[PDB]
Amino acid sequence: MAREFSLEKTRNIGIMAHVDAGKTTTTERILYYTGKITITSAATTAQWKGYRVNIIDTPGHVDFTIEVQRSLRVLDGAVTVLDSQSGVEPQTETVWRQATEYKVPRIVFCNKMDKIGADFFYSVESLHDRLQANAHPIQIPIGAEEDFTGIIDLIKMKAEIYTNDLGTDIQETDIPEDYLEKAQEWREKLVEAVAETDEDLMMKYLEGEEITEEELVAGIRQATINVEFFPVLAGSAFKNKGVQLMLDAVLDYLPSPLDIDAIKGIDTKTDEETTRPADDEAPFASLAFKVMTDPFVGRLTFFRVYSGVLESGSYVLNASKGKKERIGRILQMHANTRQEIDKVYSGDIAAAVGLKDTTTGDTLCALDAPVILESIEFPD
């Protein structure tokens, strides 16, 4: 009947992580924290503090084919996970450059801060040296290796101290005195780096004016969405340290569907290029990204809606196959449940029951406003 979560309050994300960086644990913990109400699902519908969060599956190994490019068009932003002991590795770099080519904003989670050899600053520096990435810490860890016990928020200049490995009984305190100057130092570097991404901010910073928290957070957000800045966080997913903070950063800095360039397509009627921006009033257009065989409802086809709205029990056009398709039931797969819905809006992800001739990469769109979307980048 009504759109539950607005476009502004939607986050379509992927987790970019090599198997050594702890992809599965991080994903499992994210699904746990965002699922409050082995088969890995193509996309999980979830929530975090009033925002819709859709976690989209991505490969744990380097993909040099076309399949990688497709998932990058479905997700809007990503969390890149690093093994704090190793920093950026060759495989990590390739994945990072692909994501930059396809303009995917990212926050970086330096995982395994409790492992022997874990070095947050080394990991941060490797982003600059090996990728020329404009990465800046928005946190500094309290301790390292078995002494890793907390995380300092550079924005608020407060600290979280963990008392267990469950993610409960978190003590919110002031920064310990032995880390205050170091925190001040890294916060100054952060302010300076953010100021360098915005002319109006740099003018104020150079003139010595006070940059507010709201202005600093907004600056980080805009630069991150522009793929010209990468906030760096720390934690241990397996020991439930820094997970909630990282999820907060997804909301704070990663893009909503309105923050991304509108998807391009070919209008088959005029034979010219067009776009399908996130607009519930515009004609329906979507991309299928995974075909699943579910052991309950049967053939499920996952899709991402870019424009318009789709009602369950309707007819749409598979513009890639050149034929009309019936959309029966529509489901959204949660971590612990499966919800049936009668309408999917722009920017959301869902799964249609029993679609006959639809495969990954196909455009599903309005019968009256046909378009072929750019799943694979158009030739030139």
Binding residues: 17-24, 57-61, 111-114
- State how far the alpha carbon of 180 is from the alpha carbons of 136, 354, 370, in Å: 18, 58, 59
| DSSP SS3 for 116 | coil
d(CA 321, CA 330): 21
How far is 361 from 367, CA to CA, in rounded Å? 18
* Amino acid code (one letter) for 199: E
Beta bridge partners of 343: 311
Nearest in space to 74 (alpha carbons), one of 262, 377, 284, 304: 304
CB 279 within 8 A of CB 307: yes
Rounded Cα–Cα distance for residues 219 and 206 (Å): 16
Whether 7 and 258 have beta carbons less than 8 Å apart is answered as: yes
End-to-end CA distance of the chain: 43
Three-class secondary structure of residue 177 per DSSP: helix
Annotated binding-site members for GTP: 17-24, 57-61, 111-114
CA distances from 140 to 32, 64, 121, 186, 187 (A): 25, 34, 9, 8, 9
